[PDB]
């Protein structure tokens, strides 16, 4: 039995913080807003949600969130249009995804629309924090952690669902990135949990990302299997725009076979391209073997990653088997990329009205 | 750099918890002692270590420990012998394993002998919490977590090291004596080669909860984790698995899976190999074990004992494995269980100070 948005408790800050300075560098995830949502669950079901000042968490030292990684998160954006109106991009898919993560970790179920409403209310209260400068947004970070005060590994009897907000500018995306493609690093496995947005999938990538910087790359290209499938880039889904082995122009991204996180932007790019009907759009396994041949034969136009933070990130170099592979993404416009960026921007900032946007 | 035991600050508690009484059996991991260790790290390095009252943590909402699972833990035991002297079992090895975990997650390094001293100092303060009844001990849980107040996925600039203590009795109900049943379904993967299954990291355990529930639903108490096309037996629950049998070459052997990435290198595991190796009475090997081999060893009556090892259980017999829909009887209890009993007996004598040994670290 879910918490309800009707029952919200508002508690406004006693001393508001000073928003970032216009033009000053908004660093991603370092700056937070005045308020936060917090909801507690226990053996008396969910409690009343509350909007409250950005305050620390008080956890029992045995909290299962900290011992056995009973934690999952989401990530989505609110955009402030010209008319100072704020909109969430396809938040329903994030609520869908968060509930699936919750179940995977035996965490408590909740009503998707109730949480979206509390999020709406939370953003409303802090709507001024939502910046309006070009390419800026409010990053929204929901989290659900276990909070069992016992060392047993078991279905928790207690949990906390909370939400924080960051004004953001950018994360790197007009400029492309280099990838490290080393098969020894494995992000996720079939029958694993790489397809859920659980905190435990990210911690182990930190050292890997360091090795990429050490080898002069900016991101990890997570390979999988003996045929070296391209699964994902850092925390982004991967797309390739190429002329395929059968001479047909297509946009491919790996299918959702377990080792791919089902990105909201990924789906949106699939959706958007289908609607155009101008080229083939497919979900198919992509191997290094295939990418090398394609590059040698000049059939590759663009490689890019997708995700909420970067939206669409061009790729121009992959360090594979100790040798750099050039990727002509930037030579080729990048047309598909710039076109995707434009329409997403038009939609997100309200230029074109669209069912994907949810107004705050 | 590191924190130093010489710099320990002590804040004794002003509100002692009521210790557990008689007719109140110990539930594993639910009862905590009066004090905790706590050490913070940041840009200025490791702060000063302190033993303080058992209290809640105060965490920034963006704490990387909660969003990207920058968390690891340990688990070891303190045993009070008949003379009332308290000893830790091979703690050095837990410190070795904790530092390896920390490096894998880019968390701050520390001096093992310094943490161990702090842990000793901690247990000394809460010495009266250590039970002395047969099969009771004090379970010690160190933890290291990232504590960056930033949603970026990166090497943290702040961490928190803490240690809490639990007086414990048995882990399973009538545990180590009464055997357990296992669900062995190859749909479930605990870890993969090139993953982090060989580190004691929080992230490895949360996904298993649902699987544990599936074993209950199917009438089993534990999960036998299989890996690979040839269904290798990796671990059981949170224990390393061992098989004592007459292998296909007709030689009597104790086998356990090798440390090739999907196996958590348990201290009890390592100890059982050391003990058996030392004895020199049968062949002791680290080798992959597959279901095909087990099925064949069973139908040819070559298996004597199957069991799990780990700090909580110690040595745990298995009597049944449900392989998809085939219910396999494991004759562990009909074979004594002779090796299990021997291991338990020698571990008991070492742990409770019946027989002085270099494996025990006096508190
Ligand atoms: C969050 C995430 C993505 C992209 O998700 P969006 O919903 O598009 O922002 C891709 N891959 C991984 C591994 C992720 O964690
Ligand atoms: C802790 C643990 C073990 C056993 O470790 P010991 O050091 O023997 O207590 C075995 N397997 C897993 C998965 C573990 O987490
Ligand atoms: O939204 C995206 C994709 O561009 N990345 C975000 C950026 C913050 C760090 C992080 C960590 C885990 C999962 C997503 C993310
Ligand atoms: O000591 C052992 C093995 O017998 N298991 C412990 C028991 C507490 C629960 C847990 C959770 C994760 C890793 C180890 C453990
Ligand atoms: Cl999926
Ligand atoms: Cl190892």
UniProtKB/Swiss-Prot annotation, chain B:
Substrate binds at residue 139. Changing residue 235 to K: In HVLI; reduced catalytic activity. One of its GO terms (biological process) is regulation of hormone levels. Gene3D superfamilies: 3.30.470.10, D-amino Acid Aminotransferase, subunit A, domain 2 (3.20.10.10). Ubiquitous. SUPFAM superfamilies: D-aminoacid aminotransferase-like PLP-dependent enzymes. GO terms for cellular component: mitochondrial matrix; mitochondrion; nucleoplasm. Changing residue 316 to A: Slight reduction of activity. It is an enzyme of class 2 (transferase). It catalyses: L-leucine + 2-oxoglutarate = 4-methyl-2-oxopentanoate + L-glutamate; L-isoleucine + 2-oxoglutarate = (S)-3-methyl-2-oxopentanoate + L-glutamate; L-valine + 2-oxoglutarate = 3-methyl-2-oxobutanoate + L-glutamate. The gene is BCAT2. Its main location: mitochondrion. This is Branched-chain-amino-acid aminotransferase, mitochondrial. It is found in: Mitochondrion. Homodimer. Keywords: Acetylation, Amino-acid biosynthesis, Aminotransferase, Branched-chain amino acid biosynthesis, Disease variant, Lipid metabolism, Mitochondrion, Pyridoxal phosphate, Transferase, Transit peptide. Pfam families: Aminotran_4. Catalyzes the first reaction in the catabolism of the essential branched chain amino acids leucine, isoleucine, and valine. May also function as a transporter of branched chain alpha-keto acids. InterPro entries: Aminotrans_IV, Aminotrans_IV_CS, Aminotransferase-like, B_amino_transII, BCAT-like_C, BCAT-like_N, BCAT_family.
């Amino acid at each position: 039995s879910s918490f309800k948005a009707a029952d919200l408790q508002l508690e406004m800050t006693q001393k508001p913080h000073k928003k970032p300075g216009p033009g000053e560098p908004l660093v991603f995830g370092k700056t937070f807003t005045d308020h936060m949502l917090m909801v507690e669950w226990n053996d008396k079901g969910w409690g009343q949600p509350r909007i409250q000042p950005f305050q620390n968490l008080t956890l029992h030292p045995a909290s299962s969130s900290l011992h056995y990684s009973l934690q999952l998160f989401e990530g989505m954006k609110a955009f402030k249009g010209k008319d100072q109106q704020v909109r969430l991009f396809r938040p329903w898919l994030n609520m869908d995804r968060m509930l699936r993560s919750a179940m995977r970790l035996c965490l408590p179920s909740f009503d998707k629309l109730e949480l979206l409403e509390c999020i709406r209310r939370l953003i409303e209260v802090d709507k001024d924090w939502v910046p309006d400068a070009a390419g800026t947004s409010l990053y929204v970070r929901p989290v659900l952690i276990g909070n069992e005060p016992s060392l047993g590994v078991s279905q928790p009897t207690r949990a906390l669902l909370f939400v924080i907000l960051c004004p953001v500018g950018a994360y790197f995306s007009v400029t492309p990135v280099s990838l490290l493609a080393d098969p020894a690093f494995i992000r996720a496995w079939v029958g694993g949990v790489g397809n859920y947005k659980l905190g435990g999938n990210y911690g182990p990538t930190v050292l890997v990302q360091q090795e990429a910087l050490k080898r002069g790359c900016e991101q990890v290209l997570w390979l999988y299997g003996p045929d070296h499938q391209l699964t994902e880039v850092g925390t982004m889904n991967i797309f390739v725009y190429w002329t395929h082995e059968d001479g047909v122009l297509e946009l491919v991204t790996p299918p959702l076979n377990g080792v791919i996180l089902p990105g909201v932007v990924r789906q949106s790019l699939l959706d958007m391209a289908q609607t155009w009907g101008e080229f083939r759009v497919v979900e198919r396994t992509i191997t290094m073997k295939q990418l090398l041949r394609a590059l040698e034969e000049g059939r590759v136009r663009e490689v890019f990653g997708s995700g909420t933070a970067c939206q669409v990130c061009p790729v121009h170099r992959i360090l594979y088997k100790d040798r750099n592979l050039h990727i002509p993404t930037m030579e080729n416009g990048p047309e598909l990329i710039l076109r995707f960026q434009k329409e997403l921007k038009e939609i997100q900032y309200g230029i074109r009205a669209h069912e994907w946007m949810f107004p705050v």
